[PDB]
Design a protein around this nucleic acid. Structure first.
Length: 53
DNA sequence: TGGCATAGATATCGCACGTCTATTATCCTCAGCGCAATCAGCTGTGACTACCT
């Protein structure tokens, strides 16, 4: 199941990247949660929105 | 005949409009101290009586 569902659909809708840890959009975080640019530079894009692990 | 503009048809993302339980220091109460006019006992003074001369 993990192998099948590892980034298979490849969604590119802004709403889908929210509350989705597999994508973890920078703008779709919380006040207390924050990205780490050291281990996440770029993994994908959606309407000019970068993806971080 | 064929290139593609121009609008019909349709969602689509952003801005704005509702709730919800807590990223962290209160509000009264009783016991313990204190302050100011009586009242009573320690100590001083006079009245009464013992003893050395």
């Amino acid at each position: 199941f993990q192998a099948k569902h590892m980034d298979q659909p490849l969604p590119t809708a802004i709403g889908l990247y929210k509350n989705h840890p597999l994508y973890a959009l920078k703008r779709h975080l919380l006040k207390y949660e924050a990205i780490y640019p050291e281990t996440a530079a770029i993994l994908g894009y959606c309407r000019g929105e970068a993806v971080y692990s």
